[PDB]
Every structure is written in C-alpha cells, then in structure tokens.
Design a protein around this ligand. Structure first.
Ligand SMILES: [Mg+2]
Ligand SMILES: [Mg+2]
Ligand SMILES: [Mg+2]
Ligand SMILES: [Mg+2]
Ligand SMILES: [Mg+2]
Ligand SMILES: [Mg+2]
Ligand SMILES: [Mg+2]
Ligand SMILES: [Mg+2]
Ligand SMILES: [Mg+2]
Ligand SMILES: [Mg+2]
Ligand SMILES: [Mg+2]
Ligand SMILES: [Mg+2]
Ligand SMILES: [Mg+2]
Ligand SMILES: [Mg+2]
Ligand SMILES: [Mg+2]
Ligand SMILES: [Mg+2]
Ligand SMILES: [Mg+2]
Ligand SMILES: [Mg+2]
Ligand SMILES: [Mg+2]
Ligand SMILES: [Mg+2]
Ligand SMILES: [Mg+2]
Ligand SMILES: [Mg+2]
Ligand SMILES: [Mg+2]
Ligand SMILES: [Mg+2]
Ligand SMILES: [Mg+2]
Ligand SMILES: [Mg+2]
Ligand SMILES: [Mg+2]
Ligand SMILES: [Mg+2]
Ligand SMILES: [Mg+2]
Ligand SMILES: [Mg+2]
Ligand SMILES: [Mg+2]
Ligand SMILES: [Mg+2]
Ligand SMILES: [Mg+2]
Ligand SMILES: [Mg+2]
Ligand SMILES: [Mg+2]
Ligand SMILES: [Mg+2]
Ligand SMILES: [Mg+2]
Ligand SMILES: [Mg+2]
Ligand SMILES: [Mg+2]
Ligand SMILES: [Mg+2]
Ligand SMILES: [Mg+2]
Ligand SMILES: [Mg+2]
Ligand SMILES: [Mg+2]
Ligand SMILES: [Mg+2]
Ligand SMILES: [Mg+2]
Ligand SMILES: [Mg+2]
Ligand SMILES: [Mg+2]
Ligand SMILES: [Mg+2]
Ligand SMILES: [Mg+2]
Ligand SMILES: [Mg+2]
Ligand SMILES: [Mg+2]
Ligand SMILES: [Mg+2]
Ligand SMILES: [Mg+2]
Ligand SMILES: [Mg+2]
Ligand SMILES: [Mg+2]
Ligand SMILES: [Mg+2]
Ligand SMILES: [Mg+2]
Ligand SMILES: [Mg+2]
Ligand SMILES: [Mg+2]
Ligand SMILES: [Mg+2]
Ligand SMILES: [Mg+2]
Ligand SMILES: [Mg+2]
Ligand SMILES: [Mg+2]
Lengths: 147, 122, 257
RNA sequence: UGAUGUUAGGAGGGCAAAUCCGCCGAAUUUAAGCAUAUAAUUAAGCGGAAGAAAAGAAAAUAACUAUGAUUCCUUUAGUAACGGCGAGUGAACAAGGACCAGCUCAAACGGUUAAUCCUUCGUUUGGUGCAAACCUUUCGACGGAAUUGUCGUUGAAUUAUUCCAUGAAUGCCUUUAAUUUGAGCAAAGUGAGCAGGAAUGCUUCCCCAUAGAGGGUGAAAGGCCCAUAGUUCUUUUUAAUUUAUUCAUUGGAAUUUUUCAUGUCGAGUCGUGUUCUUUGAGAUUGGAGCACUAAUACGUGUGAUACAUUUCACAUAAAGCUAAAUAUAUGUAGGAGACCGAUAGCAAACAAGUACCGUGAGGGAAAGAUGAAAUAGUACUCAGGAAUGAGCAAUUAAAUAGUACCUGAAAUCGUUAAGAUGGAACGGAUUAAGAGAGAAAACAAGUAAAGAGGGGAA
RNA sequence: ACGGACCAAGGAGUCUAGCAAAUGUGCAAGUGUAUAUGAUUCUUUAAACAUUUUAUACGCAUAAUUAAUGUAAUAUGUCCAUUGUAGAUUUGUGGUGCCCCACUUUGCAUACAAUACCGGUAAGCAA
RNA sequence: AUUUCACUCAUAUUAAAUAAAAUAACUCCAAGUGGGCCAUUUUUGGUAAGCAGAACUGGCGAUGAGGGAUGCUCCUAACGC
RNA sequence: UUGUGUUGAAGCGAAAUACGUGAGUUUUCGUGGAACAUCUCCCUAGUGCAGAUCUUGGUGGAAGUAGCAACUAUUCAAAUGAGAACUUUGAAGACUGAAGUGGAGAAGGGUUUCUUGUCAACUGUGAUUGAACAAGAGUUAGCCGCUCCUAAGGGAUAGCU
RNA sequence: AGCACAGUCUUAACGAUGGAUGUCUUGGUUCCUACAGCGAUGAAGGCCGCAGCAAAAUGCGAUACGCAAUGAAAAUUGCAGUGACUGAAUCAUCAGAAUGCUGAAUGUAAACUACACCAAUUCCCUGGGAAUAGUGGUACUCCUACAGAAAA
C-alpha cells in the first residue's frame, strides 16, 4: 500500500535519501551481470565461488522418466501401519505383515535407523540397499523383489 | 433494471433519452391522473392529456384553480389553461406554462381514438 | 486504466541549447498557437501521465481454504454473544435470547406485510425503525458514478429451503438473506465488524451440526474438516487470580518511592 | 495447329485489417569499449483470405505390464542443450484437462458393347405468398466433351441369417415442456399545521410492497408522471407423447460355411557432396542454390557423436479434403466499474481532424454553466447628434443574477480615512503610547412579594 | 560563482516479474484444492460455496554425493534414542535476608571439542 | 597424555591500585561515504610561498554562544523553556 | 457506525479574552445559494511545492518614455456635417517630364469592379474618406484566343527482367 | 462661508481588472458479451446540387431537409402557409419506386465540360399516331462453346 511506503517520510527533504555528493544516476556500474570478472570480481568470488568454467560430460537427450526413483528409510517402515494394526503384531508372535511400498509411491528402500528387536517384517520393492537388506534380515524378516 | 439485465439503470443513458425523445414518445410521457369519479366510470388510473380536456390545478402557485386546456407544447413539456395568464414587460398577455404531472383532469373529451383505448384499459 | 499512448501522439522534439529556452521537446510547425509548446513530460500541459495505469495490476488475492473456514466459524460464534451484537449497533434491548431460533413456519411466509409484522412482534420495532430513517444521499463524486444512496445493515435471515422467504423478506430496507449450505463471510462480517444479528429457522439451526461433523452424513459434511481449538481453556483470568491456591503463593504488597 | 472474331454465356481488377497466411529485411540498445553475439527470425516495405484463418488422420513416440490424427489450458522447466562457455539464449517425450471424426484420388478389377459428363429447347407433380417470388419433383430431343480414359467395385465366387431403399388408396396430425421476437396490463396520500416565490423539508394522521432499480416534476418523493416486481398474448425452432391397415416389385448391404489368388503401393523425386541462411541441435535442426543421381516392400525411412559388420523395435515419404475445443489495439450493437471531472478525461463534452500553417510529404488548436419560468430578456419619463447615464418609473424571491450573465481568490490599480518619512525597505528581543473588539473565571447563591410559562406524580 | 520580474493552477522513487531477510497468521512430516468439474450459484454474483460415490495429477520439503556406470547415513546386542566441559529448570539438607549462597539431584537451548557412519579421492591387498 | 578417588589453596574486604565497568557479547538486514583542509610539535623537495609530500594528537567540515574592532580553523566554553 | 442542511451546505473575505511546542483544529460576522461529513474501527491512491533558463494562463516597474525623418510644398474662400490641416467645389503656387504614379497585356490574385447606403472594430494623428461593413447589379464573338500540327521531352502497347 | 503642502511607503473599508475555488455534466476511458465484410447488378473516397424567405453542420439526389407503403395518430409555427373536424399535420418503421458528374473506371483524352466509330432513339393508343441530336454499345487478361479462313 502506498500508505506505508518509505518514500513518504522523505517528502520534505531535498535529496530523497540518496545524498548530495553521490547522486542517484542511472546504471553507474553497468547493466545486469555486466562487470563480473573485471570490477565486480570480489562479489562474485566471495559469494559465488565456483561460477566460471565448465566441467563434466554432455547428455544430449535426457528423458528423465528413465531414472525416477523416490526412496524410504527403514525408520518410517512401521509407521505406515495404523496404530491399532501396529498393536496386534506386538502381542501375537506367529504372524508378520507383508508391506508393498510401491503401492505408496516408493521405489527404493534405504537403510537409516533402527528396527524393533525380534519383530519380523516382509518387504516388497524394486531396489534395496545392502545395509537395509541386512537390517531386515536381522530382526527375522525377508526382502522380495518386484517389477 | 431491477432483475432483467437487458435494460439500463444508468443516469447518463436514460437522462439522455428523456431530453431527446422523439415526438411520438413525448405524448406518453405527458400523462395526467384521473379524478376519483372518473376512476369508477373507467377502470384506468391515468391517461395522456389531450387538448379539450378540463383540469384542476393541484400544485404550484396557482393551485386550486380550474379551467380548460387550450394548448399542448410537446417541445417544452407543458400545457396551457384558458384563464391562467401573465403580463410581459411590454404589457402583452401570455399563458403560464403548467407541467402535466402537477394536474388532475376532471372531464374528458372522447372520440373514436379514445374509446378504443379506454376499452382496452378496462 | 488509461489509454495506451495518451500524450505521446506528436512528432515533437527539443530545440537544444541556445535560443534562451528550456530543453523540453516542443511541437513543430506554425499558424496555430499550439506550435512551439512543450509536448510530453509529466510536468507539461497535455503531456503524459507519470506512470500510466495498467490492466496487469494485481487486482485479486488468493486465500488459504483453512483460514476462510476458520474465519467463518469464529464469525458464527460471535453472533451468539449478546454484548457483541449490541456493540455493532443493533437495537435488540427488548430481545429474549440472542441466538434467537424461530419455528419452521417462517420458511413459508409470502407477503412483505406479514414479514414486517413478524419482525415487530419479535421485539424488533426500534430495529426496523433505525433502517427506514437511515436512507440518505451520499456526499461526494460517487453520485456521478451510480452510487446514489447509503443505508445501514439490518438482520440476516438464514433458512434451509425457500418456500416464500426470499420474496417475502426482500424489499425491506437493510434486510438480507442467506442459505445454510452457502454462507458468506462478507455478509456475516460486514466491513470486517463482528456481531451480526442473525435469525435462524429450526431446520437451519439443526443442519449446523451435520455440516461440521458432529453427525456424519454423505455429501453434506465437510470432508475431513476439524473444528479449531483454543490455546486457552478458560479466559477468565481474574477468577484464577482470586483462587485460594494462587493467593496463598502471592507475596505481601510493597510500597512505592 | 496457331492465329482471328463488338460471335453466345461467364470470371479477375478497387476499398478495409484488430485477430490470420506467404515473402523481404535493419539499426538504435546490451555486453560498462568492440568486430562473433544481442536487439530479432522484430520495426518499416510487397503480396493473399475468413467469421475465424492455419494445422490435421503417422515414413509419430517409447524402450514400459506400453501409448495412438490436429489444436489449446496446467505442468515438464529457465530443465536437456547453445554461447568472445562471456553478456546472454533455450525446446521435446511421458502426466492432468477442454473437445472429440473421419475420408478421397493415384495404382489393382469391369469390353456381346463410356456404364460417364455438359449446353440449349420442351414437361410433370405438391406445398408457401395479397402480390413479387420460391421450394420440391421424374421424363424427352438435337448438339457437343470424352478411349491420349469419364463412371462403377475396393481381390473374386459360393453358403445361411438378418438389415436398407423404392408404388398405390381408405384414415392420422392431438396434448405438453423448453428456447426466441414483438406487444398489452400492472398496488398504495397529492390529508391536516410551520416556514417558503415554489414541497419532494420538519411535525402529525393514514397505507402498499413478489414493486424501497433509475429518471422526471419550481427544494431530498415506495404511495404526483414514465418505468420497476409480476403476469397474459405473440413470432422462431426442437424435444417427448398421439395410428398407421392391405397389397405389389426392383435393386443394395453386414456377418457367417466353404473355393481359389497373392496383386498394388506417388522419380531429376529421396539421398549424398559443397556453399549461404536459420534452430536449443552439438564431426549440422529445417530451408534454399549448384553438381551427382537410387531401391521395389526381404524395399525404404526414424531410434539426438563421425565409421565398418550385424540383431531388434516402430512406421509406411515424394497427391488431396475435413467440424469442435483457440484468437481478436477493426467495424456495429448491448451492459458495467473502490476510474477522470473542462490546464483532467480521446486531439476533439461546442457547425473538431474543424479554424489556421506549409509548393509538398505533413502539422494542428482555443472555446461548457442567467433564471423555476423569458409563454417573465428590461415597458415609460428626462438629458444627449449619438453611445450612454439618471429616475418620482419597471420584470423577479433576487438584477452587486442584464446575456463579456452561478460562486467570484491572488498578482496589479482607484477612492476615503489614519500614521510614518536627513543616501534602501522589511525583521528578532523587550516594553510604551494610541485605536478597534470583548464578559465563556475576570463578585453576590439564596430569601420575600407579584406576573407570564413548561413539566412529573396522586 | 550559476537559477530566480510577480501571481494562480500543474509538477518528480511508481507498476509488474523473480529472489532473499524481517515480522503477523494457519496447519505441520507434510503443505498448497493447478487447469477443470458440481451446485435448489445467478441485480449485486466477474463474488461466495463444494471436490469425483489400506484413496498413486503437479510443485516445494522429507537425503546426500559423484564427470560418470552409480552407490547411499551407529546396528540387533536394545522402543532404544554416541561421549565430555560449562550451562536454564527440577529434587533433598544447612546459612544470611519467594531471593541469594555451601553441598546434593536432573542436565533444555547453545558454545567448544571427541567419536562413529554415507558419497568422492589417495594408500595397502586384490576373483 | 588422559580417567577416577582422597586431601587442601586468601575470599565479609575481594591473591596489587582505581573505575555513572553489563551503556556487556553475538547474529541478521541495509543506508551514506571512498575530491578533504587547518593548528602546536617532529619532518622531505624547493631561494621561497596563503607551494608540494608524510607522522602523532586536537579541530574545521557537520557548530551555534562570550572575547580577539572586523574574520570557517586562535582563547573560554559546546546549546530544552 | 451515527450525523448536519431553505429556521441556509460547500466555498470565499475579515477576524478570535479560543486550543496545541508545531503541522493544524475549532468558532463569530459578511457574502453565497445546494449539498456536506464521520476521530467508532478499518481499506485504498494519479495524496502535501519557492526554486527545475520548469509547463499553461494572467499581470507589472521601465513609461506617457524610445519614437510617429526617404519620395522639393503648400495657401485663400466655399459646401456638407454633431464635429473638417489629410472628404468635395473654385482660385493660386508647384511636381511627374514620353527611360512618366501616361496607355495596353502575361504570371499571380478572385469580386477588390458598378450604383446606393453607411461607421462597432480597421484605415499606427484626425476622418463625414476607403480596396472596411450592408443591399442589389454587372462579363453577349463563324472573323480575338484556346481547341488542330509538330519540338526539346512525358505516358503507354509487344517483348524481356 | 472656511481649513488639510506635494511625492513615497504602511494598515483598514468600499470598488476596478482577472478567472482561481466549490458545486454541476446528453463527454471520455477500461473491461465483459454477441455478431461480421463491400465491389463491373459499378464499392470506399471526391465534386456539384436540392428549401418561400436558407451561410455552416445534419439529411437527401432533377421525384432532391423528402415520394409510395406499414404502425401510431392532431397538429407543425419565426412570419407566410398546409391539416380529420383518419392513405391528409407530425413521429416511427422501411421490404416498392427513384438514385446527378466521377472514381478499379473500363471507347480516345484531361490545369479541355475536347474528339471518335457502330445501331437513329423514345413514347401513346390497339396496325395506327407523336416526339427528340436525344439513347445504348465499343478497355485489358482469361475459361467453355461456336465460326469460318490459313498451316501441316
Ligand atoms: Mg537530513
Ligand atoms: Mg542533487
Ligand atoms: Mg535574456
Ligand atoms: Mg491528457
Ligand atoms: Mg468534495
Ligand atoms: Mg485489370
Ligand atoms: Mg487484390
Ligand atoms: Mg557498448
Ligand atoms: Mg554505456
Ligand atoms: Mg560506441
Ligand atoms: Mg510490418
Ligand atoms: Mg474477404
Ligand atoms: Mg481451413
Ligand atoms: Mg489443409
Ligand atoms: Mg505445454
Ligand atoms: Mg550455433
Ligand atoms: Mg533467438
Ligand atoms: Mg495428452
Ligand atoms: Mg485408374
Ligand atoms: Mg425563499
Ligand atoms: Mg430554492
Ligand atoms: Mg426520484
Ligand atoms: Mg418504485
Ligand atoms: Mg508410399
Ligand atoms: Mg541466428
Ligand atoms: Mg526416442
Ligand atoms: Mg497425406
Ligand atoms: Mg461509462
Ligand atoms: Mg481538453
Ligand atoms: Mg444555480
Ligand atoms: Mg538627497
Ligand atoms: Mg554551472
Ligand atoms: Mg537571470
Ligand atoms: Mg516468513
Ligand atoms: Mg522447480
Ligand atoms: Mg560398500
Ligand atoms: Mg578364484
Ligand atoms: Mg566523487
Ligand atoms: Mg567550534
Ligand atoms: Mg585585531
Ligand atoms: Mg470538507
Ligand atoms: Mg503527483
Ligand atoms: Mg500545487
Ligand atoms: Mg508556484
Ligand atoms: Mg512586458
Ligand atoms: Mg518623444
Ligand atoms: Mg494618413
Ligand atoms: Mg519639372
Ligand atoms: Mg526632377
Ligand atoms: Mg531622360
Ligand atoms: Mg470602388
Ligand atoms: Mg461608395
Ligand atoms: Mg487612426
Ligand atoms: Mg466586402
Ligand atoms: Mg462567347
Ligand atoms: Mg482567331
Ligand atoms: Mg519527340
Ligand atoms: Mg503629506
Ligand atoms: Mg387504406
Ligand atoms: Mg397511416
Ligand atoms: Mg448509377
Ligand atoms: Mg475514359
Ligand atoms: Mg491542351
């Protein structure tokens, strides 16, 4: 709103806040990203170090649908179940759940966290990591590969 | 209008339409009210004012006087009554313009045209 | 917005220095007293406006759905406190209860005179009087832009189905209508003020528990909507301060300088 | 075969452009200079159409459990890529929606008979018109075009079920619902009192509302006038619902059972080399000029890094037509706004692209308001050659509202009064002498008597 | 040293895109109902209301690192939540006036360090 | 080196004095500025200069009041009525 | 939200035993003749002028000042008229001096021509004058010209680009 | 009957000049919706005319500020005039009739109201009469048909 703008405070003063000696002229240092590498070098170097130069290989027609792959850690693996259904698997020791993470939008199971001791679980997925697969085998479960 | 969006309620438009109305629309705008007695004999409430009618002046400096209509001025939106007059600075006599909505007409002058209208209105 | 080139349709240019005049552009030619005048520049008569207005100024806003629902809910609650309705300017001194529910015969009244009689018998005579006397001709240029009058807001009748209420309660100065399943914050809080006087029909009053999920029903209840909670349990601070437990922990009053 | 023909019948030409289609083609500017780059496949120039135009029924994606003509919206994404790798530039597939539609020629096949087409002159039916005029509808003749190729089929037969078109007379056209045009009707005070030139104001006594939108009327009107809510009739066309009975041919089509035949598929084109442009396109994305110049479906083309020998997938180039979803600084009509209010808003609220300027291409203003009513615009007298002034005289509520007419600021000037005044004037501080104006704190509650009023209780 | 003979009206940090910091509001491992569609929405309303009758449109966030094929956060002895110094709050005794001290108990935020693990690179060994 | 445990080193006058010492420490987002000159004392080039170039403090710039008749920089002294 | 107004709004001129440190707010009298606020809390912007050789419009001192100087030169009497140095008549004194302010044409102008009337502005002093203003008139061809012929040249047709 | 020096500057009151301020608005501006070309059967633009008294703008075309027809329907008015007493005075609609010279402009030309060739042309009555130098046609390119000639 024009009501609360800073310029209304300087309405009686001469220079409108820009100074007697160094005026407000138009483009006194260039246009856009003009002077970098010559006289804007310090700003570029201390705020954006690796800006100049090129590195790596070209990929001419990418098609990102080929490598789409959302992930889930083993932390969040028992939390997908409702609490009441999470509850009965604790008492009963003869039955385990079978979880299909690809029905929830996850593709690769990844292995950060801690599973509950002696509480087996069976997991379906397209990809697994080594640590995740070991941690699932340790509490008495099994990993199944799908497509 | 009130509910139909196809006609206007703009002051500009229908205030321009009042002051440039064609001469065939100017007689419907120039309408007066019927007396109580004429409202039983005829089922209408108001009629456009014609020449040889008789009227009672109900509003203005000449309220209460009666008489006969002697002329209609469609350009100025005014009527003229038979003995309501004025003197100019010369001393010549003229008629005082009366607005038809300031008036109630107490005796009509019927003819072939009027009948086929009052019949429809009743 | 203004016309796109208003002020700049001329082949003017400046005379330069020398000639003992300022350096603005000027109209060329001769034979008319428009020739030789300053043409464009915001300080010149007939010149261009400073920052000509444009149609791509952002006219509207988008508001979070949850906040809109919160505001509507907190606005209905303010309709049930007697002191707030009084402080919005409604003349309800003679009313019995402020939530003010009415039987369902209201929904099928058919004549304006009957509606005025219903309002008068309920005790709202000096509320229908405030509205009639309140019509005035506005001050300012809004008269020349189709804004002739200015009236005050009256009661807001809320119904579930219309069997005459719509036509019956129109034409009364200041009275407005609304249906329970389509409620508008712009009517419930006119100008941003809180405490609108409302009149509920019985079915309108009962639908209000099915809409908000106390009783569930298909295609009527708001899907997965939870009614907001307060960060305070009981806002009566001075009843807490005067409790025996609190008073036993206070410390002797001290002296000023 | 060409010229010729005031032979008979017809077509093109110019204007207008906001949206659309084709060509031609800059520089200003940015890079803090500048030449590649950018500005820009833009401005100016030249051509061609419609209510939309253009595009369009795969020589397309993908690499999956696969999708399926074009267009446009949301996203992919400021991403893959291009770049004195600087400044800067920059698409495609999948996903969610709007809409939804498919077809023709060329090439195969038809020769006990071009089946095809056009001009001119005739005739034969039913409906609609007051009239003008129009619609529908078979059957002839003479002449010409065409085998240097019109028309039919969409490989051709056989077998069963079923569907479609065409001819007659005795009847049958009711009822209802929605879209459209133009008309008719449409409630309730012109009651007291005050003040006013005049109520639409104030006080008070009534009322209408499915109508308290807007305008008009001597001052602010739900009940004074037009209209407004509503409703009746009318024209347009389009959905249901209401009857078809009897008989009589001739030709078509879809699928099914078996029989035999694997035919055709767009060339100085595609492609390659080379030169210039253009693109995000990179040992070259599309286009163009020149030189060379293919194959025959097992062939040809695409699968984003240049080669050789191969596998796999997808498609079927070099001919054509086609609604809808999209756009619209133009023309014409309708509606509206937290927009401007006569130095503002379009240049133009007025005899405005006007008056006027330039040899010409062109340039281009200023300027709204008496009063309710002039159907009240200034009668009469005196002075003066006249303009004009004055009145014992005159319109109006008002003329210091008299047409250069609402209100009527400042700069600048006139008149009267009061002050000051030895080579500037005005100022700050502090008092004094004059002059104008003033009682709300700048004294007096209450008490007694009489006179006029206004209220509250019982 | 430059502008200013006088008076009236006009006359200059704004709008849009994109990013960040600060602050207010809502919900919270989620959050934002896109384009559309629906409705007994239709003077106002171009507003407001709704969401498809163990629930895969898209953006940002929830995971990093490498040119890249790719790989991907203590580890199953215990649902436990790495280690130390200072430190807010709490627990139990005593001192001087609920406060401050001397011990005792617990140990937020954060500062300084240590350790373990993930991606890339060296070194050693390598089917 | 580190980790534990036991013992013990002034403090109420504070391991020397003095202290309108916490008006402290740190993080974030931004403005203006980047032509200076002068005085006492030290000091370079120049015959010198109201000339040119440096050092430590205090000023003028950005600042008025009393005094030096007068004066941007000298002396006293810095500013609500 | 809740208020003022034909028993007089906004605006303007002069003011006040008035309030505030201040920007300002409030009130009296006069003029004026039709609309005007909200400070209860919010929204919004083309929102505050001493200057820019600033834009448009109006107005000063200079100032009754500079100036109204080429072309030899005027006088007496009368008429008209409200009013005659510069309208008309008569008498004088003079100039142009046939290479003429004498006659007739072209380019250019367009009614300035004629008769009558006549003075608001113009005719840089006056003006009864006038090319100014108003009403009405006036241009006659077989023989004067154009129209015809061709010139330096222009535009076209066939063809070509 | 008499008395104030003159000039310059300051204040008040009443005026002159000028057109600010307030109020007003048949105008602008933006958005939304709907429809959409015209021309040899002569367009857009240009010029010349038309009224009782008639300059501009507006409207019309030798029938010329308007004809006929259809819907309303008494006046139009500055004077003079015309009007039922309802095809008539006026308003609206607009389908019939009529529509000057030009202009792509198209017989040849163009600072010309200049000059060709071909058919004489139009009207009234039902074969007769009458009038008028008046009317129509003639660009270029192209397609279908036709006509004969000429070349092979
Ligand atoms: Mg400052
Ligand atoms: Mg400056
Ligand atoms: Mg000068
Ligand atoms: Mg303008
Ligand atoms: Mg105002
Ligand atoms: Mg042509
Ligand atoms: Mg053309
Ligand atoms: Mg440059
Ligand atoms: Mg530059
Ligand atoms: Mg340069
Ligand atoms: Mg162009
Ligand atoms: Mg067209
Ligand atoms: Mg098309
Ligand atoms: Mg096409
Ligand atoms: Mg897209
Ligand atoms: Mg390139
Ligand atoms: Mg580009
Ligand atoms: Mg799609
Ligand atoms: Mg064939
Ligand atoms: Mg009065
Ligand atoms: Mg009045
Ligand atoms: Mg009204
Ligand atoms: Mg009404
Ligand atoms: Mg092919
Ligand atoms: Mg390029
Ligand atoms: Mg691909
Ligand atoms: Mg094709
Ligand atoms: Mg408008
Ligand atoms: Mg203007
Ligand atoms: Mg007035
Ligand atoms: Mg002297
Ligand atoms: Mg200078
Ligand atoms: Mg000067
Ligand atoms: Mg934030
Ligand atoms: Mg992104
Ligand atoms: Mg590993
Ligand atoms: Mg081995
Ligand atoms: Mg500098
Ligand atoms: Mg000092
Ligand atoms: Mg001295
Ligand atoms: Mg005001
Ligand atoms: Mg401004
Ligand atoms: Mg101003
Ligand atoms: Mg000024
Ligand atoms: Mg001057
Ligand atoms: Mg002199
Ligand atoms: Mg003279
Ligand atoms: Mg001589
Ligand atoms: Mg001589
Ligand atoms: Mg001589
Ligand atoms: Mg003459
Ligand atoms: Mg004369
Ligand atoms: Mg003179
Ligand atoms: Mg003349
Ligand atoms: Mg002649
Ligand atoms: Mg001759
Ligand atoms: Mg020649
Ligand atoms: Mg004196
Ligand atoms: Mg008839
Ligand atoms: Mg008629
Ligand atoms: Mg013609
Ligand atoms: Mg010709
Ligand atoms: Mg000639």
């Amino acid at each position: 709103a024009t009501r609360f703008k800073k310029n209304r405070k300087k309405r009686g003063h001469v220079s409108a806040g820009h100074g007697r000696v160094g005026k407000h002229r138009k483009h006194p240092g260039g246009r856009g990203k003009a002077g970098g590498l010559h006289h804007m070098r310090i700003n570029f170097d201390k705020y954006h170090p690796g800006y100049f130069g090129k590195v790596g290989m070209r990929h001419l027609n990418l098609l990102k649908n080929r490598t789409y792959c959302p992930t889930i850690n083993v932390d969040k693996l028992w939390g997908l179940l409702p609490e009441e259904k999470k509850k009965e698997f604790s008492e009963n020791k003869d039955i385990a759940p079978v979880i299909d993470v690809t029905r929830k939008g996850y593709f690769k199971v990844l292995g950060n966290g801690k599973l509950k001791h002696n509480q087996p679980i069976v997991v379906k997925a397209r990809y697994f990591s080594s640590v995740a697969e070991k941690k699932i085998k340790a509490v008495g479960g099994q990993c199944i590969l799908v497509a | 209008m009130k509910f139909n969006k196809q006609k206007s309620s703009s002051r500009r438009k229908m205030r321009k339409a009042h002051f440039t109305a064609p001469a065939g629309l100017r007689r419907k705008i120039m309408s007066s009210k019927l007396s109580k007695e004429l409202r039983l004999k005829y089922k209408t409430r108001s009629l456009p004012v014609r020449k040889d009618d008789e009227v009672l002046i109900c509003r203005g400096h000449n309220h209460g006087r009666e008489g006969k209509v002697v002329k209609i001025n469609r350009k100025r939106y005014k009527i003229y009554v038979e003995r309501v007059t004025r003197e100019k600075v010369n001393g010549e006599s003229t008629f005082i313009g009366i607005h038809p909505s300031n008036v109630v007409l107490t005796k009509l002058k019927v003819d072939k045209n009027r009948k086929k209208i009052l019949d429809r209105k009743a | 917005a203004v016309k796109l080139g208003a002020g700049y349709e001329t082949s003017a240019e400046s005379w330069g220095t020398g000639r003992a005049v300022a350096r603005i552009p000027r109209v060329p030619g001769g034979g008319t007293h428009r020739a030789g005048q300053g043409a464009f520049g915001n300080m010149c008569r007939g010149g261009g406006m400073f920052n000509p207005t444009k149609i791509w100024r952002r006219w509207g806003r988008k508001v979070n759905l949850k906040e809109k629902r919160y505001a509507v809910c907190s606005s209905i609650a303010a309709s049930g406190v007697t002191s707030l309705v009084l402080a919005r300017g409604h003349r309800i001194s003679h009313l019995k209860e402020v939530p003010l529910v009415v039987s369902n015969d209201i929904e099928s009244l058919s004549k304006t005179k009957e509606a005025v009689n219903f309002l008068v018998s309920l005790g709202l005579k000096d509320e229908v009087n405030r509205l009639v006397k309140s019509k005035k001709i506005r001050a300012g240029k809004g008269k020349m832009r189709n804004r002739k009058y200015k009236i005050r807001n009256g009661p807001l009748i809320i119904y579930e189905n219309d069997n005459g209420v719509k036509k019956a309660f129109r034409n009364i100065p200041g009275v407005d209508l609304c249906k329970v399943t389509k409620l508008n914050l712009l009517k419930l809080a006119p100008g941003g003020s809180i405490g609108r006087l409302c009149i509920w029909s019985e079915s309108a009053f009962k639908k209000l528990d099915v809409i908000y999920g106390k009783i569930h029903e298909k295609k009527v209840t708001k899907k997965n909507y939870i009614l907001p909670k307060s960060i305070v349990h009981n806002p009566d601070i001075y009843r807490i301060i005067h409790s025996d437990k609190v008073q036993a922990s206070l410390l002797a009053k001290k002296k000023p300088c």
